Symmetry: D3
C-alpha cells in the first residue's frame, strides 16, 4: 500500500524508501508517505532517525515522468513539499542519518544533504545529474550542497552532473564515512544513540543556526545551549561519575 516503510532497529527509527522497481524515485505519493512516516518516527521513543532505500539503491532522484508533467504551478507545489520535508529533517530534535547505497542521486541525495550525517556503502554512486534534463536542483542541491563541499565543488557537481564513487564523495565532504558492510554502519549509528538526547539536539540547532549569523552571535548561542544542558537529567547523569 505504501511507498515508504517505517521500521525499528534498537534505538533507531528506520525509514525506508520503497519503490525499487523505479529505483526508489520520488513521486508525489512517495513524498506524501515520507512526510507521514517521518512524523511517526519523530513521535516514537527512538533516539535517531535513519533514512535509507529498499534493495540495492537509496534513490535515483525525482521521478522523471512526474517532472515532465509539470507546469510552473505544479512544479512550485512539488518543491514546496520537498522543502517542507527537508526542513523537518533539519529541525528535528533527533539526529537524522542517511545511509547511502547504489544509486544515491538528485532529489533523493539532496534530501540526504539536509540530514545530519551521511554514511555510504562502498558501492554507492553519488551525484546530482538532473542538470542534464534541465533541472537546477531537487531539494538543496544548489543551496545546501555548498555548505558541505564548498562553493566551487557545488557548482561543478551541479553543472557537470558528475557521478562520484563513495571515496570521492567522502573526500569532498559530501559523505562522512564509507563502510563495506552494513553492520559497520549500524555500529556508528548505535554509538550516536548512546549520547544524551538533549545534547545532540543542541549540537544540531547550533550547527544549523551558524549559517544564519555572524560568529559572536553564534558563540553566544552555543554558550546558552551549553548552559541549558545543565537542566537535563540525562546530561547530569552522564556527568555523575565525576561529581
Amino acid at each position: 500500500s505504501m511507498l515508504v516503510e517505517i521500521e525499528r532497529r534498537g534505538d533507531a527509527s528506520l525509514i525506508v524508501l520503497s519503490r525499487p522497481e523505479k529505483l526508489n524515485a520520488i513521486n508525489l505519493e512517495m513524498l506524501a508517505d515520507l512526510a507521514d512516516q517521518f512524523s511517526k518516527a519523530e513521535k516514537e521513543d527512538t533516539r535517531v532517525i535513519v533514512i535509507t532505500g529498499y534493495g540495492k539503491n537509496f534513490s535515483a532522484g525525482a521521478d522523471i515522468n512526474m517532472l515532465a508533467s509539470f507546469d510552473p504551478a505544479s512544479a512550485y507545489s512539488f518543491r514546496l513539499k520537498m522543502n517542507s520535508i527537508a526542513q523537518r529533517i533539519r529541525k528535528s530534535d533527533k539526529p537524522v542519518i542517511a545511509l547511502l547505497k547504489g544509486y544515491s542521486m538528485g532529489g533523493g541525495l539532496e534530501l540526504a544533504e539536509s540530514a545530519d550525517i551521511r554514511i555510504a556503502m562502498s558501492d554507492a554512486v553519488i551525484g546530482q545529474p538532473e542538470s542534464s534534463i534541465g533541472i537546477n536542483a531537487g531539494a538543496g542541491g544548489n543551496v545546501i550542497l555548498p555548505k558541505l563541499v564548498g562553493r566551487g565543488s557545488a557548482a561543478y557537481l551541479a553543472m557537470s552532473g558528475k557521478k562520484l564513487n563513495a571515496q570521492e564523495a567522502m573526500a569532498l565532504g559530501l559523505v562522512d564515512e564509507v563502510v563495506d558492510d552494513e553492520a559497520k554502519a549500524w555500529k556508528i549509528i548505535d554509538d550516536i544513540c548512546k549520547k544524551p538526547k538533549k545534547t545532540l539536539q543542541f549540537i544540531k540547532r547550533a550547527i544549523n543556526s551558524s549559517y544564519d549569523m555572524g560568529l559572536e552571535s553564534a558563540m553566544d548561542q552555543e554558550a546558552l545551549y551549553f548552559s541549558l544542558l545543565f537542566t537535563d537529567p540525562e546530561v547530569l547523569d552522564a556527568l555523575s561519575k565525576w561529581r
Copy 2:
C-alpha cells in the same frame, strides 16, 4: 608572434567563448592595460551567442598575479582605484548569466588565481602551480583571496594559504577544494567544458544564482529561492524540450 599583440585575446571554440590573458613575457601578470582589456573582452564574450566563457592564459602559464612594478607605483588612492577595477571584473564573472570556467596551468598565482576563484569552475592542468604569494610583498589579496577563498576551502586553509604564501601542486589544490578537476591533457578539459555546454542555459544560470546567493541568507530563505527558480524553469523552451522524451 607579430600578430599576437593585445593583452587579452578573445576566441571561440564551439559553444564556448575563450578569453586568453596574453602577456607571456611577463608570465601574464596583470597590469592596468590588461585589466581594461579583460573587462572589454569579457563584455564581448557575454554578448556572443556562446553558452559558457572559458578563461585561460597564453602559453605555459595562466598568470603570475598582479604586476609588481604597478603595485610598487601605487599610493592609497591609485591602489583603491585598481582594486575597484579588479572587484568589478570579479563581480561580472559571478553575475554572468553564463558559467565561467577557469583553466589553470603553470603559474596560477595571486590576483590572477583570485579572479579564477570567482569563476564557477576551476580545472587545472597537472603541471599547475597554485597559490597566493602576495603577502610576501605586503599585499592582503588581489581580488577575493581573503573573502572568496574561504568559501572554497574553509576558514583555516584560507588563512594558512594567504598568510604563508604556500605553493600548491594541482592535486593538493584539488584536495583542498580550490580546484575541481585535474587533467593531464587539454582535450580532457574541453570535454568537461563541452559537457557543460549541453545543459540548458537557463538551468545553469539558475544554479549559479542560487549558489551565489546561498552565502547571503539563511537556509530556509535559500531553499525558498531554489524552489522558485525550479518553477520558473518550466517556462523555458530548452528545459521543456529536454524533458519531452518523458512527457505524457
Copy 3:
C-alpha cells in the same frame, strides 16, 4: 601558574601547563590563559603561538569542573571561554596552534579560533565531549563547520570520533602535519617575515567574510588593500620594484 609565556625569536609562545591532568582546562587555567594572552599581545613579537607542555596539547575541559556546574556557573564558564576565543580571533597578531598528542574538546576548540593549526604527526584530534552530554566547549558547533563543512562538523561533534593528524588535515581541521618540531617553527618563522599590517588585514577580512555578503566583503578587502599603502613596512617590502 598553569599557563607559561615564553619567547622564541619573533614569536610569543604560550604554553598550557598542567600535564598531570593532560592540560585540561579549569577556571584557574582560563584566568591564567587570559592574562598570558594579554602579555603576549603587548610584546613586540609578531605572532602568538599556543601549545601544551609535554606530550599533549590539551585533553579538553576539566571534567570534574564540568560535573560541578549548574546552569548559572556553566554560563559563566562559557562566557569566559567565549571571551578568550574572541580575543584570539580579534588579535592584531596571527595566532598559531601547535597540536600534539591529545588535542581535544574545549582545548581543540580554542585552537579552532586560531588562524592556523599545525599538528605533530602523533596528534589525536577530536571533540569527544558529547559522550558526557556537552555540546561544545568553545566553537565546537559554530566555528567547526567553517573549517570542515556542515556535514563533517555534525559528524565529528555527534560521534566524538578521534582523528589522526592526516585525517584531520584532509578534513580541513588542521593546515599542516609535520614529523618534527623544527619544521613547525620553520612555517612559523616564514609567517613572521610578512609585514604585520598585511597579516592583520588578511585576518580581519577572512573573519568578517562570515558576517556579510560577497560584494560587501570584496568592498572591504579593497579598502584594506588601499590602507596598506599607508604602512611603512609594506612600502619597504615593495621598494625593490619602485
Copy 4:
C-alpha cells in the same frame, strides 16, 4: 463538557476567521492552557476557507500579558519550555499563508502585545493601552519584545520601550510604527479588514513572505525573490481574473 471552558474561542465573520482570547477575569493573561488552546484554534483557522485571520481579546481588553503567577512558578527548564511554545505560535503567525491582523484594545501588553508584533497588521481601538512592562518584574520579553520590536519601531525605541516599560496610548504607538491604524469604532476596523479580504489570496501570501524574508538577506537577493514571486502570480487564477478587465 469541553465547550464551556475553552480559553480561546474561534468565530467566523464574513471572509475572516476571528480568534478571541477569552479569560477576561484575568485580563486575558496568557497561561499554558491558553497557549495550548491558541495553537489549536490557530490551526483550525488556517484550514478554514477564510481569507484572513483576526486575533483579539474578549471584552474590553486584548491581553495584559503573560500570567504572572505562572511566571513566578518557573525554573529555567519550565521557563524555556514556555518560551518554546510562545515562539512556536509566533512563528506560525508569521509563516501563515493568510494575513494575520491583531485588533488591539484596552490593555494590550507584554507577551500578548508581543504575539501581535508577529502579526502582519495591528489595528488599535482609541482606548488601547499599549506597552511592554515586563522588565519591571525581571522579564526580558514574552515573544519578540526584544527581537521583533525593533523591526517595527527601530533600535532606539525598542530599547527604550523594553527597558522603561513605558505605557503608550494608541496615537503614540501609531507614531512609533507599533500600530498601523487607530479607529474610534469597531466597524471601522472591520472595514479595513474586509478591504484586505478583497485582494487575491496568493498576492497577500507572497507579500507576506517577501517582507518576512527581507530581514534574512541582503537587498539584491530579496529583490530577486520579489521578482520570482511576482512571476509566479501569473499562474494564479484569481490574479489573472483580477487583471482581465484590461486584457488586450
Copy 5:
C-alpha cells in the same frame, strides 16, 4: 526627419543636477517596456555627465501612476519575470550609482514608479502628492521593492499594511512614516534642497551612500569597520581637503 523617433524619458540639465523626466502624461507616466528601456538609457547618460546629482521626476502633474496595467494584463509568467528583471536592474543602478539620486514626487506617485523612487537616496514630495502601493488590488505583490525595500524605509508593520491595504497617503503622512524626506509647496523649494546636496563633496556623498546601502548586508562591527575605512580614504580626495582647509593649522 523621416526616421524621427520619440522618447518616453527625457534628460535635461539643471546646473549641477542631471534631470530625468518620465514623459508619458497621457497615461499618467505609467511604466511600460519602452519607458523602461528609455529610462535605463537616460540614466546611463546622466551618470556619464559631469553633474553631481541625478534627479528623477515626471512630466506634467504626475510622477507616475505605476506599471502600465494593459502590459501587466498581457503577461504570462515568463514575460512577467523578464519585466521584473528589467525593473530590478534599473533599481539596482540607482542604488549603486556614485551620484546621489533624488526623486521628486508629485500628483500620482504610486506602485512601480514609487517603488523605483524607494531605491533613490532621497525623496522629496510636492504637497499634492498621492503616494502608495495600490497594486495588490489587481493581484500584484510589488513592482520594484515594494515588499523588500519598503520595510527598510518605514518598518515591518507599515510595509505590510501599506502593501496589503493599498492605502493612499498624502505627502505629510508619507513623510511621517519615513517614506518621504521633505514636503514642499512649490518647486523652487525642492531645488533649494537639491542645491544644498550639490554643495557637499562628491566623494563624501558617494561613501555615505555605499555605507548606508551595505549596512543592510552585514553586522554592525563589520559596517563600522567599513565606515572607518571610507572615512580614511576621504583624506585622499582634493575636494574634501579643500572643504577642510579653513581649519588647517
Copy 6:
C-alpha cells in the same frame, strides 16, 4: 584627576547612575584625541563601579558639537584611520556594556558626539536640543555610526537624507524620526526616567540589550531562539526571582 581640577571628561555618581560628562565647553565639547582617550578611561571606570546605568552628557549648555575640526583638518589617511578606530572602539564598548547607557542630549548635539550617542541604548533630549549630522559639509561621511547605525534608528531614507543634507533638527523632529526616545523640558524629568530604569533587575536589562543588538545580525527565528534562551537564564538570577516573589505559590 581630583574634584576641584577641570578635565576634559569628568566622571560623577548620581544615585545608582554613573554620570560621564564631556567637558570642553569653550569649544562646544568638541571631541579631540585627548577627549577620546579620557572618555575611554572614564567609561572603564564607570563599568567597574557598582552603579546600575551609565549616563553620558555634556558640561554646560551643550552635549557636543562634534569632532574637533582643527583635528580633522590635520589628518592624513593613516591618522584619520587611527582616529576612527578609537571612535569605533568606544562606540563598541557602549554597545557591549552589561549596563544600559543613556545619552542626555541638550543644546548642540551633533556629528561625532551625536553618533556616539546613537550607540547608546537610550537617548533623551532636553527641549532646546539642536540635533544632526552636519559633517558632510566639511567632506566627512560620519564620525561614529552616522551612516551604519543611524539607519537602524530612523530607517534607510531618513538616514541618507540626514547625512547627505546635514539638516539640523529640533528635539520634536528628532523624536518623530526615532532618533531620540523622549523629549523633556526639565532635567529632573530626565532623571526620573533614568531612576525608573535603575529599578529593574540588572540581568534583565543586560539581556534586553544583547538581544536587541544581536537581532541585527540574524534572521528572526534565530533571534527568537536567542531571546527564549536569555529568558530562561533569567530564572537563575536572584534579583529576577526576588522581583517575582510576591506572586510565588
